[PDB]
Amino acid sequence: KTSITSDIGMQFFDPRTHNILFSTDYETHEFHLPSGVKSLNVQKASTERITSNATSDLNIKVDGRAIVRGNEGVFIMGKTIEFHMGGDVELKAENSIILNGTVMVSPTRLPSSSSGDQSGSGDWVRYKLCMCADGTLFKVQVTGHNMGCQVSDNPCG
Amino acid sequence: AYGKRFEVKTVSGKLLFSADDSEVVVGAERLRVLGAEGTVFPKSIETPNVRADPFKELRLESPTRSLVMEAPKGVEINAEAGNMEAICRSELRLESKDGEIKLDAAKIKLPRLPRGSYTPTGTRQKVFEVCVCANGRLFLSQAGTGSTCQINTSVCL
Amino acid sequence: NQRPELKNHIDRVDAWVGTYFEVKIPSDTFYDNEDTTTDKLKLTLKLREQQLVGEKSWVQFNSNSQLMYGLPDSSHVGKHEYFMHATDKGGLSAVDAFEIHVHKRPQGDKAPARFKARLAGDPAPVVNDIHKKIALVKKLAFAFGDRNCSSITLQNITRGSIVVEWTNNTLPLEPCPKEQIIGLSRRIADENGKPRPAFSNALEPDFKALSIAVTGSGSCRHLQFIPVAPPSPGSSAAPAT
Amino acid sequence: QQTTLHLLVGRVFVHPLEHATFLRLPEHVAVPPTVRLTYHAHLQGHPDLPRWLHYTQRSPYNPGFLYGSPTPEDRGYQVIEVTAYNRDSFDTTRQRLLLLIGDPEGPRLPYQAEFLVRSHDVEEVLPTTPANRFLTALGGLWEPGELQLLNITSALDRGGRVPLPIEGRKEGVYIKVGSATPFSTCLKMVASPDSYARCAQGQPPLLSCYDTLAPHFRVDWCNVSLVDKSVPEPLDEVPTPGD
Amino acid sequence: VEVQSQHFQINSEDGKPLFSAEEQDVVVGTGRLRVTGPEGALFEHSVETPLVRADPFQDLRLESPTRSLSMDAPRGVHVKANAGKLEALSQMDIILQSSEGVLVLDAETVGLTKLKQGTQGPAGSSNGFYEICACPDGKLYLSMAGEVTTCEEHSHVCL
Ligand SMILES: *[C@@H]1O[C@H](CO)[C@@H](O)[C@H](O[C@@H]2O[C@H](CO)[C@@H](O)[C@H](O[C@@H]3O[C@H](CO)[C@@H](O)[C@H](O)[C@@H]3O)[C@H]2NC(C)=O)[C@H]1NC(C)=O
Ligand SMILES: *[C@@H]1O[C@H](CO)[C@@H](O[C@@H]2O[C@H](CO)[C@@H](O)[C@H](O[C@@H]3O[C@H](CO)[C@@H](O)[C@H](O)[C@@H]3O)[C@H]2NC(C)=O)[C@H](O)[C@H]1NC(C)=O
Ligand SMILES: *[C@@H]1O[C@H](CO)[C@@H](O[C@@H]2O[C@H](CO)[C@@H](O[C@@H]3O[C@H](CO)[C@@H](O)[C@H](O)[C@@H]3O)[C@H](O)[C@H]2NC(C)=O)[C@H](O)[C@H]1NC(C)=O
Ligand SMILES: *[C@@H]1O[C@H](CO)[C@@H](O[C@@H]2O[C@H](CO)[C@@H](O[C@@H]3O[C@H](CO)[C@@H](O)[C@H](O)[C@@H]3O)[C@H](O)[C@H]2NC(C)=O)[C@H](O)[C@H]1NC(C)=O
Ligand SMILES: *[C@@H]1O[C@H](CO)[C@@H](O[C@@H]2O[C@H](CO)[C@@H](O[C@@H]3O[C@H](CO)[C@@H](O)[C@H](O)[C@@H]3O)[C@H](O)[C@H]2NC(C)=O)[C@H](O)[C@H]1NC(C)=O
Ligand SMILES: *[C@@H]1O[C@H](CO)[C@@H](O[C@@H]2O[C@H](CO)[C@@H](O)[C@H](O)[C@H]2NC(C)=O)[C@H](O)[C@H]1NC(C)=O
Ligand SMILES: *[C@@H]1O[C@H](CO)[C@@H](O)[C@H](O)[C@H]1NC(C)=O
Ligand SMILES: *[C@@H]1O[C@H](CO)[C@@H](O)[C@H](O)[C@H]1NC(C)=O
Ligand SMILES: [Ca+2]
């Protein structure tokens, strides 16, 4: 090492013009970013927008959790949005979820009933889904056989 | 100056500057960048916090590529005062290899499902219908033939 | 009725520790198709999610007159976020998120004048009641004859007896202008520190006034302003080398 | 791809961006109005435009606009890259522009007036025809003389407020007009302290000479900044490199 | 300690430059900087980097204090977590959209927390209601409501 100890710190100025080119008294002389930095490691970046190059991705790599908080809404756009979640996916809104567009579901993983499993005589409580005119979903109790979505009441407001 | 490490510290001991082989540590309490057209960091940034100024909006955009985010321990998205919109064009995939999907909103709408068409004879493929168990777990059952959404054994609570 | 639109944002409210701060919501922040102005809507303030702001919080929102007032505490330095919900008669709500900065005064320790007023009673109810603190500051401002409460910057409240110390933000930092200090001393008390009758009338009936004192700080830190001071001894550091 | 343009220091330059150029649709056909585009211009090798440039656009359907008045310290060669980004097919296109900042020609313009047009927006003034119409309308009051634009800026950049859409309220623009002939008596009277005193309490601004900008240009008359550049600023001191 | 010269420089032991301050501008040659101030950097307009990491802090927090955060990528947006979980919260709405494509819900079990109930009564009007069916392709479709099952009657849609 090559150590310097002082109450203020080192200061370097050019004698030709007598302007402090680099001072360690940060309070009096603010620090300007030196050219040539390839990477930066700051405690908090108060930026405004982060962009990649004209022909490169924007990789965001972490080791713990990533927390995203838009205080007036989070908007996502693109071509194919994917969520390769290894655990649970929990969409928890408070007014409505609008699953716009064509909806699909994997049949090979969902529990699909097989033909020849009438062993259970007890008619446990079950429901059949139903699609109202406006869009709301509602379930109806199943009692007998060969029944559909005929309901006297108005469930979807 | 030569050697292996050059450092500057106060009398009590505090790294105000240290230019070793790996990195250049600077003890400034706040670094300010005054570029007008922006700054370019070829390699990366390393921060534990990103925070837009209290008059603008953060925008993580990639101009002509894809945006890939990695977070092994989990991802949380919050929008305290706005819709959590997610608009795509080709395919929106929600994956959960060994988990579940939960929708806890007060109501659910799907107002673009493909409307059916009347066919006298119809087709012979078993078009499953969707039915919900007591605890809210979905399942598929064979088309109208004898029994109903019953025949489920013990896979739901 | 379509939900109200957020025409104009606030996104920032600045405040300094100690001084009374208040902000009036502008007349074009919100706009509905029918009510057409924010003053006709129902404005409310919320902390986060939908939980309400407690009455003991340092920030309060007077909804009927659409005003926000507060006196930030000494330990609330930093940044906070809030939410303003506008609800119309149709039940539709529009939310604007803004942020309040609480920053220390630039003259926190360089204030030329530091005051002191002694009041009989207990300080426990006063410290833990924002309304009582606001009333005390307004009464102090009225006693001094200045209707603007923003000048007085409270600093400390002690135990045992209610001893309150403050500065005057209007007073210049350098040099210390002794003449208006002594004029305020005459208008506030006598040479021996007994309070002026106007001061006693103004402060009452909230507390009981017994005596006040005024010391120096800043450049002329070696001067006491109540006319019982031995002002000649100052730093008294004249050694010989 | 690239294009070469000529610019004069201290003058307004506007280069509208249109769907026809970027989408490269056939000339004999017209681009459908339903298409949407969001251009984003930036300096080459940098993530944003320089200080003197500005980009504006009202709606994705409407064409974009690049404007701004170059500063003397920004003279030389500049490259601006524009990245059009369709919002329907989510496919992008790129283009380049070459700007050569020249130098002003002819005598200097020492008499400048900063207006405030509250009846128009920055989108409706940038095209050539409204600017020319405004210049001809203002030529009557400033006659004799020719008026050349020097600076156009949206009111929102000057600490403005978003207007309530009640009937026709708009943000408004600031237009700076320079000329070499001295102001007439009307403009001098408008800039007199009497008008400021009148609109201090709410009295209408004093106006004796006949207006021509009305009704197509509602102008805040008692807020008009007059600047005289005669007797130019003295030379600033510079340090000589020491021995 | 005052250094008065024309070109200050700090090198490695071998001789590779590490830092240099002169009249032109300061230059950092090691290719890495680190500010240890609690207030951190304060940028002005924009930042252009191809990678954002979170050092050994093991936690990244993107936040917009008073406006709407928004992501964007023309080629698509990917979110990955080998052993994590997604929790999307919103006090107003959660809107998932696809202009032309599909919405794949790949999960062995999918649960619906909130779903009301409606009494089965023949007296009500059949119009204004629909029944959801899922043909072996995997897609979902609607059929006109009725007192009996009707999924097989309109099974031509996914032929
Ligand atoms: C520019 O000129 C237009 C019209 O000529 C003004 O509307 C605009 O603001 C107005 O400025 C005049 C004086 O220049 C002022 O008398 C008007 O009202 C005052 O507003 C201030 C705001 O703090 C009050 O304190 C004061 O008591 C008056 O009411 C003011 N109009 C408004 C709506 O504020 C002019 N702008 C500028 C920057 O000069
Ligand atoms: C902090 O110090 C300032 C001194 O600059 C105080 O301002 C003065 O306050 C007094 C009483 O509050 C006012 O009377 C002063 O106004 C003037 O008063 C004289 C009589 O003393 C009149 O003749 C004048 O016409 C004028 O009205 C006022 N001075 C100024 C320049 O405004 C300020 O009050 C004090 N802070 C507090 C909380 O008292
Ligand atoms: C825009 O930014 C991207 C950032 O990814 C630039 O691409 C990158 O360019 C660097 C050159 O410094 C490449 O590094 C090189 O990689 C090769 C192969 O790994 C290696 O052998 C070299 O020694 C060097 O390290 C990097 O790979 C490359 N990355 C990608 C994804 O292309 C791009 O050049 C920038 N374009 C412009 C116009 O600025
Ligand atoms: C679910 O997604 C569909 C597909 O986009 C949404 O339908 C769209 O709804 C908007 C608003 O109702 C339509 O915009 C309107 O278009 C008409 C012309 O048709 C125009 O005159 C209006 O001024 C307005 O711009 C849009 O056309 C329509 N798109 C299609 C393909 O029909 C629907 O709104 C979404 N559902 C929800 C709840 O958001
Ligand atoms: C045309 O109008 C625009 C309106 O913005 C003028 O831009 C403004 O120019 C001033 C003068 O430079 C800027 O103020 C100060 O600039 C210095 C740089 O010299 C800077 O260090 C200060 O921090 C401060 O910004 C002002 O910021 C700038 N406006 C904006 C929005 O950036 C322009 O100068 C006018 N040009 C002519 C020829 O009239
Ligand atoms: C009370 O204080 C407020 C702010 O401290 C004053 O509002 C502004 O004060 C500054 C400087 O004190 C003036 O330059 C502004 O013109 C004031 N804004 C106005 C007048 O709209 C306020 O004027 C003060 N009131 C009194 C009676 O002192
Ligand atoms: C005055 O305020 C300071 C703040 O640090 C506190 O430590 C001190 O105890 C206070 N003194 C009194 C008498 O309240
Ligand atoms: C520039 O040259 C003059 C000679 O007249 C000299 O006096 C001055 O000191 C020089 N400037 C500096 C910064 O030394
Ligand atoms: Ca806001």
The secondary element (H helix, E strand) that includes residue A130 is strand A127-132
**Residue C211 per-residue DSSP state:** E
Question: Do D49 and D41 touch, CB atoms closer than 8 A?
Answer: yes
Q: Which of A147, C90, B49, D185 is nearest to E40 (CA)?
A: B49
Task: Work out the number of other CB atoms within 10 angstroms of the CB of residue D168.
Answer: 9
Question: Do A45 and E33 touch, CB atoms closer than 8 A?
Answer: no
Residue B138 bridge partners (DSSP): B132
What is the chain E residue with the closest CA to A64?
A: E58
Angle at A147 between CA A144 and CA A151, to 5 degrees: 110
Strands ordered across the beta sheet of C21-24: C21-24, C67-70, C59-62
CB contact A56 to D (< 8 Å): no
Q: Is C144 helix (H, G, I), strand (E, B) or coil?
A: helix
- Tell me if C170 CB under 6 Å of ligand 2: yes
For residues A25 and A36, give the distance between their C-alpha atoms in angstroms, rounded to a whole number.
23
Query: Which residue is listed with tokens 């609330």?
Result: C76
Q: DSSP H helical segments within D73-116, as ranges?
A: none
For residues E24 and D14, give the distance between their C-alpha atoms in angstroms, rounded to a whole number.
36
Task: Work out the number of other CB atoms within 10 angstroms of the CB of residue C191.
Answer: 11
Q: How many residues does chain E have?
A: 159
Question: Do C30 and C42 touch, CB atoms closer than 8 A?
Answer: no
Q: Which of E60, E15, A37, A5 is nearest to B25 (CA)?
A: A37
D140 phi and psi angles, rounded to 5 deg: -65, -45
For residues D56 and E89, give the distance between their C-alpha atoms in angstroms, rounded to a whole number.
34
Report the residue from B70, B93, B129 with minimal CB separation from A62: B70
What is the chain A residue with the closest CA to E150?
A: A148
Q: Is D139 helix (H, G, I), strand (E, B) or coil?
A: helix
Give the closest residue (by CA) to ligand 4 atom 2.
Answer: A100
For residues A116 and D46, give the distance between their C-alpha atoms in angstroms, rounded to a whole number.
68
Q: Is E40 left (phi over 0), alpha (psi -120 to 50) or beta?
A: left
Three-class SS string for chain C? CCCCECCCCCCCEEEECCECEEEECCCCCCECCCCCCHHHCEEEEEEECCEECCCCCCEEEECCCCEEEECCCCCCCEEEEEEEEEECCCCCEEEEEEEEEEECCCCCCCCCEEEEEEEECCCHHHHCCHHHHHHHHHHHHHHHCCCCCCCEEEEEECCCCEEEEEEECCCCCCCCCHHHHHHHHHHHECCCCCECHHHHHHHCCCCEEEEEEEEECHHHCCCECCCCCCCCCCCCCCCCC
For residues D128 and D83, give the distance between their C-alpha atoms in angstroms, rounded to a whole number.
25
For residues D100 and A107, give the distance between their C-alpha atoms in angstroms, rounded to a whole number.
63
For residues D127 and A63, give the distance between their C-alpha atoms in angstroms, rounded to a whole number.
52
Q: Tell me the DSSP string of chain E.
A: -EEESSEEEEE-SSS-EEEEEESS--EE-SS-EEE--TTEEE-SS-EE-SEEE-TTT-EEEEEESSS-EEEE-TT-EEEEESS--EEEEESS-EEEEESSSEEEEEEEEEEES---B----TTS-STTEEEEEE-TTSBEEEEE--SS--TTTTTTTT-
For residues C186 and A20, give the distance between their C-alpha atoms in angstroms, rounded to a whole number.
51
Q: Is C201 helix (H, G, I), strand (E, B) or coil?
A: helix
Q: Is C98 helix (H, G, I), strand (E, B) or coil?
A: strand
Question: Do D117 and D173 touch, CB atoms closer than 8 A?
Answer: yes
Q: Which of B85, C103, D205, C94 is nearest to A75 (CA)?
A: B85
Q: Which of D19, D95, D28, D27 is nearest to D61 (CA)?
A: D19
Query: Which residue is listed with tokens 């000589």?
Result: D240
Chain B residues near residue E15 by CB distance under 8 angstroms: 2
Chain D residues near residue C31 by CB distance under 8 angstroms: 164-165
For residues D78 and D58, give the distance between their C-alpha atoms in angstroms, rounded to a whole number.
26
Query: Which residue is listed with tokens 């680099």?
Result: A22
- Contacting residues for E97 by C-beta, under 8 A, at least 6 apart: A98, A100, A101, B85, B86, B87, B88, B92
Q: Which of A149, B111, B96 is nearest to E111 (CA)?
A: B96
- Contacting residues for E28 by C-beta, under 8 A, at least 6 apart: A34, A35, A36, A37, B24, E19
Query: Which residue is listed with tokens 């309040």?
Result: C100
For residues E139 and E145, give the distance between their C-alpha atoms in angstroms, rounded to a whole number.
19
Q: Which of A86, E87, E111 is nearest to B95 (CA)?
A: A86
- Tell me if D168 CB under 6 Å of ligand 8: no
Q: Is B32 helix (H, G, I), strand (E, B) or coil?
A: strand
Q: Is D23 helix (H, G, I), strand (E, B) or coil?
A: helix
- Contacting residues for A18 by C-beta, under 8 A, at least 6 apart: D242
Q: Is B155 helix (H, G, I), strand (E, B) or coil?
A: coil
Q: DSSP H helical segments within C106-225, as ranges?
A: 124-127, 130-144, 178-188, 197-203
Instruction: Name subunits touching A (3+ CB pairs < 8 A).
Output: B, C, D, E
Record the tokens describing residue D175, joined without a space.
Answer: 């237009």
Q: Which of D78, D93, D107, D89 is nearest to D40 (CA)?
A: D93
* C-alpha neighbours within 13 Å on the C-beta side of residue C174: 5
Q: Is the dihedral of CA C210, C216, C222, C226 positive or negative?
A: negative
- Tell me if E31 CB under 6 Å of ligand 3: no
Q: How many angstroms separate the CA of residue B8 from the nearest CA in chain E?
A: 10
For residues B103 and A92, give the distance between their C-alpha atoms in angstroms, rounded to a whole number.
6
Give the closest residue (by CA) to ligand 3 atom 35.
Answer: A53
For residue D144, cis peptide bond before it (omega within 30 degrees of 0): yes
Q: DSSP H helical segments within chain E, as ranges?
A: none
Task: Work out the number of other CB atoms within 10 angstroms of the CB of residue A155.
Answer: 18
Question: Do A49 and A58 touch, CB atoms closer than 8 A?
Answer: no
Record the tokens describing residue D10, joined without a space.
Answer: 């201290």
For residues E72 and D45, give the distance between their C-alpha atoms in angstroms, rounded to a whole number.
21
What is the chain B residue with the closest CA to E15?
A: B2
Amino acid at C68: M
Angle at B77 between CA B74 and CA B79, to 5 degrees: 165
For residues A24 and A9, give the distance between their C-alpha atoms in angstroms, rounded to a whole number.
5
Question: Do B134 and B121 touch, CB atoms closer than 8 A?
Answer: no
Q: Is D27 helix (H, G, I), strand (E, B) or coil?
A: coil
CB contact D49 to A (< 8 Å): no
CA of residue E98 to ligand 4 center, whole Å? 13
Question: Do A97 and B108 touch, CB atoms closer than 8 A?
Answer: yes
For residues E148 and E120, give the distance between their C-alpha atoms in angstroms, rounded to a whole number.
11
Instruction: Name subunits touching E (3+ CB pairs < 8 A).
Output: A, B, C, D
Which of C144, C170, C185, when mutated, tests ligand 2's pocket best, judged by the most ligand atoms within 8 Å of its CB?
A: C170
**Residue D53 per-residue DSSP state:** -
Give the closest residue (by CA) to ligand 8 atom 10.
Answer: D240
Give the closest residue (by CA) to ligand 5 atom 7.
Answer: D52
Record the tokens describing residue D90, joined without a space.
Answer: 């989510």
For residues D202 and D196, give the distance between their C-alpha atoms in angstroms, rounded to a whole number.
10
Three-class SS string for E52-94? EECCCCCEEEEEECCCCEEEECCCCEEEEECCCCEEEEECCCE
> What ligand has the least distance to the C-alpha of A96?
4
Q: Which of E76, E77, E86 is nearest to E107 (CA)?
A: E86
For residues D41 and D65, give the distance between their C-alpha atoms in angstroms, rounded to a whole number.
10
Measured between its terminal Cα atoms, the distance across chain D in Å is 51
For residues A74 and E94, give the distance between their C-alpha atoms in angstroms, rounded to a whole number.
10
* Residue from E28, E86, E115 to probe the interface with B (highest B Cβ count within 10 Å): E86
For residues A31 and E39, give the distance between their C-alpha atoms in angstroms, rounded to a whole number.
13
For residues D118 and C100, give the distance between their C-alpha atoms in angstroms, rounded to a whole number.
33
Q: Which of D49, D41, D50 is nearest to D22 (CA)?
A: D41
* Resolution of the structure, angstroms: 3.5
Q: How many angstroms separate the CA of residue B80 from the nearest CA in chain C?
A: 6
Task: Work out the number of other CB atoms within 10 angstroms of the CB of residue B116.
Answer: 22
Exposed, middle or buried, D243 (CB in 10 Å: 0-12/13-18/19+)? exposed
What is the chain D residue with the closest CA to C30?
A: D164
For residues E56 and B43, give the distance between their C-alpha atoms in angstroms, rounded to a whole number.
17
For residues D48 and B59, give the distance between their C-alpha atoms in angstroms, rounded to a whole number.
14
CB contact C31 to D (< 8 Å): yes
- Ligand 2 atom with least separation from CA of C145: 12
Report the relative pairing of strands B128-132 and E129-134 from DSSP bridges: antiparallel
For residues D209 and D221, give the distance between their C-alpha atoms in angstroms, rounded to a whole number.
12
Q: Is the dihedral of CA E101, E102, E104, E105 positive or negative?
A: positive
For residues D208 and D188, give the distance between their C-alpha atoms in angstroms, rounded to a whole number.
12
- Contacting residues for B2 by C-beta, under 8 A, at least 6 apart: E11, E12, E13, E15
Helices C178-188, C130-144: crossing angle, 10 deg rounding? 100
Q: How many angstroms separate the CA of residue E94 from the nearest CA in chain C?
A: 16
Contacts with E, D 63-122, CB within 8 Å: 85, 88, 90-92
Report the residue from E45, E46, E74 with minimal CB separation from D85: E74
Report the residue from E46, E74, E99 with minimal CB separation from D48: E46
Residue A13 bridge partners (DSSP): A20, E4
Report the relative pairing of strands B24-26 and B15-20 from DSSP bridges: antiparallel
Q: Which of B66, C81, C19, A115 is nearest to E72 (CA)?
A: B66
Record the tokens describing residue A103, joined without a space.
Answer: 């909806």
Q: How many residues does chain C have?
A: 241
Q: Is D94 helix (H, G, I), strand (E, B) or coil?
A: strand
Report the residue from E4, E63, E76 with minimal CB separation from A69: E63
Q: Give the technique used to solve this structure.
A: cryo-EM
Residue B109 bridge partners (DSSP): A98, A136
Helix, strand, coil in percent for chain B, rounding step 5: 0, 45, 55
Question: Do E87 and B76 touch, CB atoms closer than 8 A?
Answer: yes
Question: Do B77 and E68 touch, CB atoms closer than 8 A?
Answer: no
- Contacting residues for C191 by C-beta, under 8 A, at least 6 apart: C226, C227, C228
Q: Is D74 helix (H, G, I), strand (E, B) or coil?
A: helix
Record the tokens describing residue E108, joined without a space.
Answer: 């062995």
Residue A120 bridge partners (DSSP): none
- Ligand 4 atom with least separation from CA of A100: 1
Q: Where are the beta strands (DSSP E) in chain D?
A: 4-7, 41-43, 54-56, 65-67, 76-85, 92-101, 111-114, 148-154, 173-179, 225-228
Angle at D212 between CA D208 and CA D218, to 5 degrees: 90
For residues D174 and D112, give the distance between their C-alpha atoms in angstroms, rounded to a whole number.
13
For residues E143 and C206, give the distance between their C-alpha atoms in angstroms, rounded to a whole number.
75
Question: Do A149 and E146 touch, CB atoms closer than 8 A?
Answer: yes
Q: Is A15 helix (H, G, I), strand (E, B) or coil?
A: coil
For residues B126 and E133, give the distance between their C-alpha atoms in angstroms, rounded to a whole number.
10
For residues E154 and E135, give the distance between their C-alpha atoms in angstroms, rounded to a whole number.
11
Q: Is D240 left (phi over 0), alpha (psi -120 to 50) or beta?
A: beta
CA distances to A20, B22, C239 from B6, rounded to whole Å, are 20, 12, 42
- Contacting residues for C40 by C-beta, under 8 A, at least 6 apart: C32
Measured between its terminal Cα atoms, the distance across chain B in Å is 73
What is the chain C residue with the closest CA to E90?
A: C49
Q: Is A133 left (phi over 0), alpha (psi -120 to 50) or beta?
A: alpha
Q: Is A92 helix (H, G, I), strand (E, B) or coil?
A: strand
Report the relative pairing of strands A127-132 and B128-132 from DSSP bridges: antiparallel
For chain A, state the CA radius of gyration. 32
Report the residue from C49, C50, C99 with minimal CB separation from E65: C99
Q: Is A116 left (phi over 0), alpha (psi -120 to 50) or beta?
A: left
Q: Is D185 helix (H, G, I), strand (E, B) or coil?
A: helix
Instruction: Name subunits touching D (3+ CB pairs < 8 A).
Output: A, B, C, E
